[PDB]
Structures are given as C-alpha cells and as structure tokens.
Amino acid sequence: EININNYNDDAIQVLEGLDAVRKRPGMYIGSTDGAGLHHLVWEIVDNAVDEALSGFGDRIDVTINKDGSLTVQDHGRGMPTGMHAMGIPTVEVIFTILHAGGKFGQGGYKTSGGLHGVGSSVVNALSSWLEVEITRDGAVYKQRFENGGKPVTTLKKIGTAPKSKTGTKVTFMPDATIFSTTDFKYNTISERLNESAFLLKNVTLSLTDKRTDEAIEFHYENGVQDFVSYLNEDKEILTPVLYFEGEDNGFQVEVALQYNDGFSDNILSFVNNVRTKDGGTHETGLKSAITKVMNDYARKTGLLKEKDKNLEGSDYREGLAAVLSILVPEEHLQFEGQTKDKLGSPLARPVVDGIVADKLTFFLMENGELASNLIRKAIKARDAREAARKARDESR
Amino acid sequence: KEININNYNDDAIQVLEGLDAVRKRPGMYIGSTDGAGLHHLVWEIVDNAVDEALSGFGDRIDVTINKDGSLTVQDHGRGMPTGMHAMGIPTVEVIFTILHAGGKFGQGGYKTSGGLHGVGSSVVNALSSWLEVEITRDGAVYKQRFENGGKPVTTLKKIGTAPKSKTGTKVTFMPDATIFSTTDFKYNTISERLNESAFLLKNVTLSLTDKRTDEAIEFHYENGVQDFVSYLNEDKEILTPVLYFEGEDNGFQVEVALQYNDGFSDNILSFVNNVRTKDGGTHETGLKSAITKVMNDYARKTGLLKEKDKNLEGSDYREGLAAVLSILVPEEHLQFEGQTKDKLGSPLARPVVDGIVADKLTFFLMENGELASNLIRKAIKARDAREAARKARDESR
DNA sequence: GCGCGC
DNA sequence: GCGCGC
DNA sequence: GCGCGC
DNA sequence: GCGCGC
Ligand SMILES: Nc1ncnc2c1ncn2[C@@H]1O[C@H](COP(=O)(O)OP(=O)(O)NP(=O)(O)O)[C@@H](O)[C@H]1O
Ligand SMILES: Nc1ncnc2c1ncn2[C@@H]1O[C@H](COP(=O)(O)OP(=O)(O)NP(=O)(O)O)[C@@H](O)[C@H]1O
Ligand SMILES: [Mg+2]
Ligand SMILES: [Mg+2]
Ligand SMILES: [Mg+2]
Ligand SMILES: [Mg+2]
Ligand code: NA
Ligand code: NA
C-alpha cells in the first residue's frame, strides 16, 4: 500500500492527456459550476471566431439541443481531414491531444484568440460524448468520442455536399459527473454571442434553443461603435461616440468611448476578440492615456490652475462607457491562464497608450468646447469625491 | 509547400512536447513572465517542501539566493524517490520532465497538500536554463542536472554519502533569461512569502540567505494564525484581543484569527493547505458571510439595531479588521482556479467555514457581551460615516 | 505621470 | 500609501 | 441573509 | 441594483 511511510517510485503517477483534465478541471476551465460549464461553449465558439478572424465563414450558429447537448456550426475552412504526422487523423489529434493546434505561429491562422492548443481537447475531456462533422471538397466527415474523449469511431466519410462548401460542426454533451450543473443558459450564451458579434463585422451569430423553440441572432456593421451605443442603450448620453483606431507593428487597436449621465465606469476590453474581463496591459494603456491626456489638456488650458492637483483617473471615467478591441500578433500574444481573463503581453501597453494618446490629444484640440465640458464634468466628480471624504472623516 | 491561410491542411497542426509547451505558453502555467512570474518559480519549489512538512517530514526549509543569481531550496523531508519509474525513466526525471506527474492525486504518499496538479517542478525546469536536484536517502546523496528548458544532461548519479537516517531534497535552478523580462530575485519578495509560510507551519524554521549581499533572515512561529494576526497589526493600535476560532468538519480543518485595529481598512488573508489564495474564493466567502450574519444577528437581538433599522453592511463590520483564515481541504475535495492557485473553487469550503465560524463567533459574542456591544457600536459608527459620505456625494452632484 | 499590486 | 516598471 | 459576478 | 446559489 502507498502511504506516507511508503513513499517510493510507485507513489508517483502520470496522468495521460485528457485524464489530467478530468482530474484537475480547475486548472483548465477555472471551475466546475455554471461558469465552467459555459466555458466549454466559449472554447468551441472561439475556434469558430478564429476562422472568421482569418477571413473564413460569415455565420456562426449555436444550438442548444433538446437533449441538453450543444452544437456550434461554422462555415470556415473545416478542420484538416487527413492523416496527421502522429499516425491518427488530424481531427482526432485536435480533440484528444493537449497542446496540439494551428495557432503556434505556423501560418494557418492570422491573429487568433486561440493559442494554447488545448480548448477543443478540454471540451472533449469534460464531455460524456462529442461529435464533429467536417465539410470539405464535396465530402462530409464525422468522428465521435465518448466517456471523456475516447474515440469510438475513426474519422469516416458519411456523405457529400456541394463541392465548394466548407465548415465544422461540433456537438457535445457536458459530463454530468464533472459539473454541478449541465443546464446551458440561454441568456448567458445570448449575451456572449451578442458581444462577439460586435467584434466581427458582417458575421452573423445566432442562438437557437430547441428546448423551448426560442432563437435570437446578432449582426452589426459598425464594430466597437455599435457596441458602445448598446452599452449606453438604457441611459441618457452626454457626448457622441468617440472612435479611435490605429496600427503599430502588426498590432491593431480600435476604441469607442461615450459618456452617459450616470456615475459608473463601464470599460470592456478584448484581445483577438476574446473578452478579458480582468483587463491587463491593453486596458492599462487605455486608462493611462485617458488620464494623462485629459489632465494635460485641463492644465494647459487653465481649467486646472497652478495650485490644483491633477484629477484622478476615476474622475475622468465617471459615466464613461468604452470598448477596447485590439489584435495582437501571435508572436507577442500572452494570456494569464487558460481562462484568458487578463492580457499579459507587455507590448500592448505602449501600443494602446501611444495610439489612444495621439488620437485623443488631437480630438481635444479640435473640439475645445466638448473638451472643456468633459474636464468640468471630471472636476465636479472630484468635488463630489472630496465632499464625501470630508464628510466621512468628520463623521469619524 | 508553405503553411498559410490558403494551405490549411494536416501539416498545419503541430503537437508540442510537454516542456516545450510550457516554454511556448508560459502564461498558461505561471501567469506572466515578469517579476511575479519569476517568483512564481520559487513558490513552486518552496510549496513542494512545505507539502513534505505538512505530511510530517522536515522541520527546516532553507532558501538561498546564490551569487550567480540561481536559487536553491533545501528541505529535510523524505526526499524524492531514487529508483526507476514505471514509465521507463528514473522517478526524479519523471517529476521534473513530465507534466501532470506527481504524488498528490490521492494515491496516499501525502496527507493534505498544496500541490495537486503534478506540474509545478516540471514547469520550473522547463523555464530554467539549468536545474539541479540532489536527493538524500538511504545513506547516499544523488544528483541530476537538466539544461536548456529541462533536458537531462546527466543521469541520476550518486555524489556522496549521508547518515543512515538523513533525508531531503535540494533544488537549485537558474531561471531562463530568454523567457523572463527580469531574472533578479528580490530578497523582500521572498522574505515576505517565507514569513507568511512560517506562521502556518508550527515550529518549522524557514530561512532566506542572500549570497549576493551576505544578508540572511529566519522565520519561526509557535502559535500559527494568532501570531500571524498580531504581525498584521504590529504597527497599529489594536482595539480587541486576538479572537481565535477553530473546528473540523468531515476531513476539513479550519482556523481563523481576528483582531481589530483602530484603522478603517480591512486586511483579510486566506490560505488553503498553506497556499495563499490572494483572490479568496469559497472559504473566504464563507468567512465573510458568517461574520456579517452573526454580527447583525447580535446587533438586532440586543436592540443595538432597532426594529426600523437596516442591517449593517459586511464592510461596516470589516472596518479595521485583520483576519487570517487557514483551512485544510482533503485532496478529494480540493480544486483551485488555475495553476497560480489564487482562488479556491472547492464548493464545500463555503458551508464548512461558514458553519464553523458562525457557530464559534455566535457563542463568543454571547460570552463576551461588553466587547460584542463595543464592536457593534464601532460598526454603527462606520455605517454613519458611510452614510454621511454618500449624502455629501449626492448633495454635491 | 500613470496604473498596478501589495 | 508607496515602490515598481512602462 | 449573505457574498458574488455581473 | 439584481439574480444565483449556498
Ligand atoms: N472550427 C474549427 N475550424 C477549423 N479548425 C479548427 C476549428 N476548431 C479547432 N480547429 C483547429 O484545431 C486546433 C486545436 O484547437 P484547440 O484545441 O481549441 O486549440 P487552439 O485554438 O489552437 N488554442 P486554445 O483554444 O487557446 O487552447 C486549432 O488551433 C485549429 O487549428
Ligand atoms: N521536495 C520534495 N520532496 C519530495 N517529493 C517531492 C518534492 N518536490 C516534489 N516532489 C514530488 O514530485 C511530485 C511532482 O511535483 P510537482 O510537479 O511540483 O507537482 P505537485 O506538487 O504534485 N502538484 P503542483 O505543484 O500543484 O503542480 C510531487 O507530487 C511529489 O511527489
Ligand atoms: Mg481554441
Ligand atoms: Mg471566464
Ligand atoms: Mg508542487
Ligand atoms: Mg500569484
Ligand atoms: Na488540442
Ligand atoms: Na511533474
């Protein structure tokens, strides 16, 4: 028996690929509650988005099936349908081998949200079954896996299609012995597809729920500008939609900003179309550029006098809605963790900072009345903050 | 033919070997490749030594920053196994070169441990331009060396003898300067982490020696989270004694110490199997829930909150609060978010902590009524200050 | 100067 | 509240 | 009720 | 401010 007094070579165990995912799902998807369940949806949708980001496919359709499984169909290039160098179908490599993919800089993708080579295989590992259908060159191919990613068929030709059609259809049943819930939630998926649609010009994303026969689709022509208008939808706005974009050594930056009459700071950031809810270097560059340029404008126009302190970043972000979307070349791309909630790529900070600072400095100079109103707004925010502080300290 | 977006076929998919994948995507394993990521490597090697001590093996963990900028961690635990592993190579090589390979999957070699993924040592090796390990066991010292991201350059070889009973593991590594934006280990960063680790290991000495400047420091504490809380309040005026609560629940173990200072900040630290969870999670949620619920219940049943008064906010009771929560979670229930283990996900930790703390704190307040009523009056004043600030803010707008 | 993390 | 690094 | 994550 | 889950 293995115990603390018998700690020898058989006390060390090696978990084969997908078994490690099933044993330690928290390392790969963060949690095994509803947030982790929907993470599986995001891995499959993100792979369809990456095809669209490289130019392939104009529709991504998600279906919640009546049995509770979930399907994602795209019209991208399809997965490669041949034999892989390691002696199994490439499709089976994609779904069964961790750190196996096409987004390590080889050239099959332009900038993509995918980069670790694990998402599809993680979905397969954490599903009681998974099926994939690839359409390419007049044929449809299928492979099925069960019980956490074990192939039960090879990749087989199952039908034909028009010669020019292409795409990938993935259906999976999340493993009810892993997750505390396997109930996919319409609104959770709907909100995420809506966000993704803002970032993919003229791609339609849709959700159909066969459990209740409800469906919704999303399509936007104007990217982050439409997104900012959506954020301020149920609010009174105090400014037009400001739009800033630029490029820098393979990086691309787009940002839309608009003030509402509220006092909340509502900044959403994205890297290669992946939501980074916890921000990171790109959000840091945006926030720094705003504060530095607005303070410089305030001071050089005398709205902040010689004796006044600079305003705080939070003063300028009161009532601000902003959407920041950047594209980062694969060679510079670095996320914190499989969940990709934060961007670590150091170059994104000067990239975003430089582009935003340049465009905003010019915008303030050309729109002086709006600029001074924005500063006066931030000064009133400072006054309210300092009034609250004085009352809090006096109460104490 | 060149791989490009118009030639996306079977050769466009590449499979990365384990350590190669770590080097290619370090953010997936250590979060970042700045100074925080650099020191993460230290925590992986230290955490393994702490896990030995948590199972009862070793009472001293010595960290050395060497003159060449490498880092050594030496423990006196059981040592890594020195034989041949079932997969074909020496066990030591499996530990350092194979991801998801280890002794903390429930097999029984460890009691409750901070390690659980089987990746930490192999990540440090992958991200080092060299690494050496020396194992002391069965009267001998064995050494193996790896270079260039984890490639063995020696076999595991005997390099000396040892007394029959002595055991331990010594790991030295040079972080890869081609990966990290800084490879300058920071004395204060490591010292702070070892200090926190010492509070949670009764009577284990942890030490740091920096050969670059010839400075050293040790940490050794007898009274656990109570010493820890006193440390947090060291440069402040305190308003209460150290309150200590502990309990057990179906293999879970909970300890918490609390003490108010005269400040207005809240300073709550949480740990799971001695791993700092800086972003909290289910155990910290349970603790915060229990405090708010029990303190509002006490305030209301004593009439300090009248019929028409709203309950106080959790932030009113945490003003000036210092608190150290340490829980032990059995392997079969243990689940962290991510390799950096900044947040506990284990669902059962919430009811476990909430139940133990609520029970103990309810009884404590009933038995210490004058102190309880003073703490409620303090939180009511915090409510008043928060309401005064909100009023003034709204009137300014 | 600035955001960030302690 | 302060040092760190961009 | 409570903390949490929108 | 509000729903979700413990
Ligand atoms: N819908 C798809 N269409 C075409 N190819 C796909 C599709 N989904 C996945 N692939 C291919 O399969 C590879 C592996 O996918 P996956 O395991 O999710 O890793 P990844 O996108 O490369 N990186 P990550 O998601 O960050 O783990 C991808 O890199 C693509 O080459
Ligand atoms: N100092 C040590 N003394 C004894 N055994 C050790 C020591 N360090 C590592 N090991 C063994 O090597 C195994 C693998 O270590 P490691 O790769 O760090 O993964 P881990 O501790 O199991 N889990 P994690 O650290 O969460 O990735 C451990 O589980 C132990 O069995
Ligand atoms: Mg992917
Ligand atoms: Mg997430
Ligand atoms: Mg470990
Ligand atoms: Mg950390
Ligand atoms: Na994969
Ligand atoms: Na390992």
Numbering used by the authors:
A (entry chain B): 5 to 400
B (entry chain A): 4 to 400
Show sentences the authors wrote.
Bacteria usually express two highly conserved type IIA topoisomerases (Top2As), topoisomerase (topo) IV and DNA gyrase, involved respectively in chromosome relaxation/segregation and DNA supercoiling. Topo2As introduce a transient 4 bp staggered break into one DNA duplex and pass a second DNA duplex through the break which is then resealed.
Comparison of the ParE hole in the 14-mer hole-bound and 6-mer outside-bound structures showed that hole binding by DNA did not significantly alter the dimensions of the cavity and that the side-bound DNAs interact weakly with adjacent dimers in the crystal lattice. By comparison, for the side-bound DNA-ParE44 complex, the B factors on DNA and protein are 69 Å2 and 27 Å2, indicating tighter binding of the side-bound DNA, possibly enhanced by DNA interactions between adjacent dimers in the crystal. However, importantly we note that the side binding of DNA to ParE occurs exclusively through K291, R321, and K346 and K281, i.e., an exact subset of the residues seen in the hole-bound DNA complex and shown by mutagenesis of 291, 321 and 346 to be important for enzyme activity. We propose that binding first occurs through the side-bound DNA process and is crucial for initial stabilization of the T segment (reflected in the higher impact of mutation of the protein residues involved). Another new finding is that certain short DNA duplexes, including the hole-binding 14-mer, are sufficient to stimulate the topo IV ATPase activity whereas other duplexes, e.g., 5′-GCGCGC, were inactive.
